[PDB]
Amino acid sequence: DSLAVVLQRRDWENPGVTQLNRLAAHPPFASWRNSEEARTDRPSQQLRSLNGEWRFAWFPAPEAVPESWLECDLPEADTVVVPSNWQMHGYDAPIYTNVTYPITVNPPFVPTENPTGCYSLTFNVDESWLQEGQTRIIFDGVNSAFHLWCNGRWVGYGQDSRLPSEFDLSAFLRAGENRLAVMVLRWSDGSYLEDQDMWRMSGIFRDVSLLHKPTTQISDFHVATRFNDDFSRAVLEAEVQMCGELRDYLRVTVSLWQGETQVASGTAPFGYADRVTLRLNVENPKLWSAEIPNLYRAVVELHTADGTLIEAEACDVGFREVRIENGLLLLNGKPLLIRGVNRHEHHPLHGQVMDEQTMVQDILLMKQNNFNAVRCSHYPNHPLWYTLCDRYGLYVVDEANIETHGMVPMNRLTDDPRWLPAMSERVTRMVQRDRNHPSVIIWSLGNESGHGANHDALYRWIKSVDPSRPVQYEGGGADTTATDIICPMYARVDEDQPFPAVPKWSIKKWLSLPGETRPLILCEYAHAMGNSLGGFAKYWQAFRQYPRLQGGFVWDWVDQSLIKYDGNPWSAYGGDFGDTPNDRQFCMNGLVFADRTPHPALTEAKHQQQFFQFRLSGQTIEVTSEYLFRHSDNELLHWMVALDGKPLASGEVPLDVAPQGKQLIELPELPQPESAGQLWLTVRVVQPNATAWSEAGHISAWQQWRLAENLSVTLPAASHAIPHLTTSEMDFCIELGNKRWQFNRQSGFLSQMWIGDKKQLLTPLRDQFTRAPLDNDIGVSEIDPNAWVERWKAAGHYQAEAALLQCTADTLADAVLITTAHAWQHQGKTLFISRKTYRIDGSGQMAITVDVEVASDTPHPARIGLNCQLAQVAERVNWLGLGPQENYPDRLTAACFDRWDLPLSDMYTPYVFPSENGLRCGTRELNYGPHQWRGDFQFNISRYSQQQLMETSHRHLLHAEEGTWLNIDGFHMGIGGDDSWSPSVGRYHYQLVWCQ
Template sequence: MKATQADINWLGDVSVFEVNRLHAYSDHRYYRTMEEAVTSGQMNMRYDLNGTWKFNYAVRPDSRPEFFYKSDFSSEGWDDIEVPGHIQLQGYGQMQYVNTQYPWDGLNELRPPALPLDKNPVGSYIRSFHLPTGWQNNPVYISFQGVESAFYVWLNGQFVGYGEDSFTPSDFDLTPFLQEGENKLAVEVYQRSTGSWLEDQDFWRFSGIFRDVYLYTVPTAHVRDVHVRTDLDKTYTNGTLQVNLKLEGQAAAGAKIEAELRDAEGNTVKTFASDVQDGLVSLREEIGKVNLWSAEIPYLYRLYIRVYDANGALVEVVPQAVGFRTFEMIDKVMHINGKRIVFKGVNRHEFNPRRGRAVTKEDMLWDVRTIKQNNMNAVRTSHYPNQSLWYELCDEYGLYVIDEMNLETHGSWQKLGAVEPSWVIPGDKPEWHDIVMDRAISMVERDKNHPSIIIWSCGNESHGGEVIYKVSQYFKSADPTRLVHYEGVFHDRRFNDTSDMESRMYAKPADIEEFLNANPDKPYISCEYMHAMGNSIGGMHKYTELEDKYPMYQGGFIWDYIDQSVYKKDRYGKEFLAYGGDFGDRPSDYSFCGNGIVHADRKVTAKMQEVKFLYQNIKLFPDRNAVKIVNDNLFADTSELELVYSLEREGHEVVRGTLEVNVQPQSETVVNLPIDVEGLSAAEYAVNTAFVLKSATLWADQGEEVAFGQFIFQQENSSNETASVDANQVHEIRVVEGDVHIGVRVGQTHVLFSKAFGTLVSLQFSGRETIAQPPLPLFWRATTDNDKGTAMGFELGAWYAASLMPRCVEWIAEQQSNAYRIEFTYKLNISADVQVKVAYTVRNDGSVHVHNAYKGTAGLPELPIHALSFKTSPEFSNVEWLALGPEENYADRAFGARLGIHASTVADTVAPYLVPQESGNRTGVRWTKVTDNAGRGFKIEAASAPVELNVSPYTAFELENAQHTYELPPVHYTVVTVAGKQMGVGGDDSWGAPVHPEYRIASNGELEFEFVIRSL
């Protein structure tokens, strides 16, 4: 649309989404010389407008400074604001996080495209500039890479243009409005527009100029658009390069094009040339044998497009990365370069806890390295096109990308979890066609040259209908080299061909298998799965196990990469990571913004341990003296890796070595390990194998582990081995039975049992007390986000009460020759038929053996945990385990854990989830040492079978009753919880999916565990 005057009514007019905006074009760079192009440095024909702008904030349109754009308007007294950046993160307006619901839900009674005009904040920006030297007679344009959600632009008091679509660029021609000397640029940004109905993503609702703004000029003959397409022959060996160009400028008519393709080493592969015809160039060249691009081996060529004017003078050079690859459907299975692909993916929001979606290059570099280091091979740009640099990094580092257009209308059709599409948009509504299609075109035209992008996505959670179907048809016609994704056809099968693959969110493994066993017409991906909210990712193996079972199961994308939490200060001035509702935002979806496998401050969560292991492309299966290596890579062998092996005896390394092993992709081999297991003394051993990088890569340092496998075995006593007992460690057992207490002394161990309280009340080793508050049976864990989603408090809450006040109904004691045993029997308020017995046996070596037995009955809810918990001194602030680790793990999230000796401070065992919850557990515990900073303390050993164990500064009840970390009490204790079993954490979703049955604990049977406490 063209116009010379701004009209505020465009905000609510679905037919107006751009005015005077330039057509979308590729995101290529361009330079004046080959030297500049080869070094790819600063573009001399671009002038950055990022930085400090003058700013005014108005809470509603009728209170804005309406004529601020005029040349004689003074902004004296206005505030400063940083661009790029969000208005709400710089001290203005209302922070708000909502997921499905629209942000005005319950505040304004609206139906699309109506807007809450009384609650539509306006940011007015002013920036003055002088044109760089040499630009005065050139055309000058301005590019806004991202503005949320709609904006008007003026230069020197004259209207320039209008744009919507927060996540693709809007460019305008400034040439007619420029003046000599200082130029006044004015931008008016509205938080709400018709585009807001299409941007109902699960994220913080910000506004402002949050991506780069820059001026640019062009030479007399300029390549406005580049479209590079590569094809491979049927053998996936020889490549063809198709290059289409659109030129503009006064010298374009007589211009000539010369193109040079160079390999990754800078060697010229081929040159070709063409004249420009009507501003267009179309070149197609057979390149011959080429190196292929894939996420495993992201080989990039560089194409240099040189533009010469009619006089033969070089006027422009365009460098363009080229990756030769094909992505296609073969026999209902997606293939990359002829090989079946499995997406080991993650959904990624652009986010920084201080800058919101105004992420930096440093953020993106950290992200791409972290994703690669943890064996992920694919990213879905949920749910909008990202900054261009992200795609360049994916090209270079090697990640497959689902590029998703900026479309989500979740709240228009799903209400309180139910599908209710009475006023769904865009649906079949023709009036929404153009605005939606514009977003698709803007994404494709900008991003089309990135080899990392292999699938276009029609958006997210916008139900179905004809409009989105037409978007998919556009994708297929504009770019037949890629496939098209859209999950929403699941809700509207009328246009099933919208998506080339069946894509579902949070389907259970059994549901996926049901689909795959029904002879489907399409392959399956989980565009979102493993909802990683809080302590989650349990049961992920059930999904990855489908990869080898069903060829048409082609992986999935974890939801999601990073927590969307924002720094805030509590009432005492201490910073914390806040979530929805913490800023007084209503409506809000509160902590649902915290679903990341990375914390918002870019610290990797413990959940990543499981992700990295289950996403391994190379699998290692060691036994006592060999390792089976399965290389599931499609293209990469193991020549760049080194096989490291070791043998550990009860956590201590006794053998270590390295081997050179080259396993070809899609093949396996068995390698003998030079480990002599003959004659090993009786103990538990672990054979560890790992592949590590021989040398540094773009994404990791030398020695980075990319694959791991462990084998644990027990070496029994040989016939000539007999266990020996150190007589110096055996002492007389002395018992003092008082009226209320029973004291037992063995050497430097002094134990006190209370008849009144029915428990152990004191355990001293060498005069140091270990019991601050006595041990009692525990059947409750602090609910995780997933537990809350299954209403665990309602369904299993009786175990909370049962854990608060068990009643000792009986105790019996027995004096033995080498031990003293006392057993306490407890009743619980949950049922008269439930019985718990805790027996303590003080042995003549000074250790205390603890046996916990539970006897349940029918009709009770399942148990969250079967444990015994006590408090000790906070001076015991360090913990060391021989257990599965090093990170926290649970029954359904321990595949990525490894047996070894791991250490931590007690404070660090509490994972910094947004809402305090169960965390810090270790499974497979053989022993644990709890010590002070001088190394003094006590040791807990598993007696017969490994136990689970948690050492924390907080009880389960303190964690349960805190909504933020700052609400937790000051640390007064170290809390030790030994469990025979704890239920898994789950992760299929966080709003009702239960933990899988094999990781739950039935309450109607008998359970027992035992452990030993001894002095260090």
């Protein structure tokens, strides 16, 4: 039992040993001794949880642990809660890595400096559990490899952190009063297959439980389902196995309860002598789908011949079919549209400890935004997660914990047949544990782990064990024989990326490959890096057009940010804990923050994933529902008519459309005003009744159209004022009453403007050709020549110097005309030339026409527009245009044209990495304090300059600059968003009107 004996074998450095005296995997059990408690999911006294206060000690190496541990708790041992992680309690700094292994690349050898978490607990046991029966401990998760000592006696050894590990303890437990000793290692052989793009982190991060069973017990049972052609008639296969002594009087009963009412049942004795097959016929079953989570509570009973109950076990069972034919993924006889998401397991204040409140809230947020698919990335999740998924309705794509991305080459390990034991354990235990749940539809053998022979073997094993689920696997080009569902990573829509032996075809070309008939779902796509989720529409357009393209999984859901205290909490990324090597802000790809505050990208995803598409044909509206089984019985359309912001007419039409059907909505006689402007038709689908995952009045979909537009009519500029512009050598001074504008003659820019006495411009009006660093532009630079920001720096756009010219004009009949031009040159090469024209009439309205030309050889300029720093600091920003949330030219789909007003705080989004943000495009009229600008432009308003945004790496380091910064841009490129390691995105003119 001594450490000097146990650790000498170095079992953590041997790929051929994955478990020692570990019991067989099985679906989670509670050992109910009463059928009613089993059916109603009441807590079972046989399952005693052991979460509480334990004793922990840290050591830099396993050998550094003294032998005084196993007899009594160390004096320096602290009191920690379990489940929890010692990495967050400051004992060592967690490290985040993307590709490079945090440890030395030498399998199966692991670094000698192996941190050891010395967890222990002293506890009592009832003699009732000891005189009879079997008592076993269940570790729902221990990262990453651990040994076990019970009362100073060695019990076994374990691995496979992300899956439950159980051992038999009835033979080391006695006299209640007892001590459990668990030693855990940060590093082991499995870490080579545990190279998730996640925080390298350890401890006991899942619940520790104590289960007591009688000598004779139910061992395993698989509940499958088959259907007829019309799904009216179906039969349930509750195959059941047991263990122990076999008595002829033993009987089993499988009872199917639709709620409190029993529908079907059956009984049979044993006879495999430990396995018995029961088939239960069900009529008109309430099918299961993401829209309707119909649940059947099937109870399996191990009961005596006279009828006394020994042990009862139950599992929620749903009736659904998932199969592949003709290249389409059919769910209950209907094609699927996977609007997925990669939910990483992460908690802002507990690391990878997950609890029911967070899980439920995540499911609620995910269902509120039309997400009906989840891929646990990249490991099986908490056991209750799947139960909640069945209860709410959410297709899950389970993913075996296999990841060896950093190994060179990728499949150096998954082709060596010495790792078949470990890979088979990590796959088969997941399959056996999570087969019964109906939500899990697609088993995935891993994310790009390289296509060897072990993946073929495991794919065939899965297809032999559970043939009711397609098996996807992305590695080896995602088109090998080890994959039923072609799942490439970041395959762009039209652009082709032909890499050697792992090419990224355009998705349509991948569909049109010769001899290819399997359906395509995107393993990962639409990186949500802050203000990103770009091309989503393009992506959703392709998904809706092409039948055999069945959606993807937006990566990723929750932001993997750990709370750091300066005492003000500030979100941090890799490298802020002193960890090296790290991967900076690449760990920040969440649709919501760690504390579940919705990102701006969430709204765009929700809009693009709506179930209702709308077509406008004159007066009528065509409404089409993407639901396949459910009727729109909880929806109510709200159409409204607005002329340049002001509403004119509105109405409500309840929706009654069949699944995959169409409904034509005839609008009333819409108003046809003679006033100048653009009429807009906004339709909003609202769910008046609160559902299990939504509140009353929930918005499900909305869309807008442009109605008849009346060309602007009257707009007479100036009244009667010939302005005697003060011509001076240093500036041109123009005064109209209390208003004054100063134009510097040495720089050629608007220096200062006056409203009476108070100054208005803290920074002269200049053109801006640059935007702050963008994740996509950066790509994998820190230098990447093809990175967009690197190309801009090489072209010197950030360091281009404006050279003033002339063309200065003079006054007219009722106004003063200023005409100027500038030349921006970097090391002598003229990058851009723009010619401006400034026009201040007798009414004070200033019209500025700028015509910009760009050299072809230089890379495309980031933005075309004017920048300045206003002296006015107002509390709100008002505009008429697309909003209210921020938008971009490539991500303006979710933006809605209306008169929006937001506080200045809302004008900047709290991205942790500062960059260009707060942009509002399609703004025909802007209001901020006393000034107002009209036309057709895009702008952002914030208290931080672009220079500060570029320089500052963290949001919490940002400081509010004096005044307000404005960047009114005529044009701007898209932000891309296809990928974050490569680019994903000549003569122009804009007209602006300045008024007050």
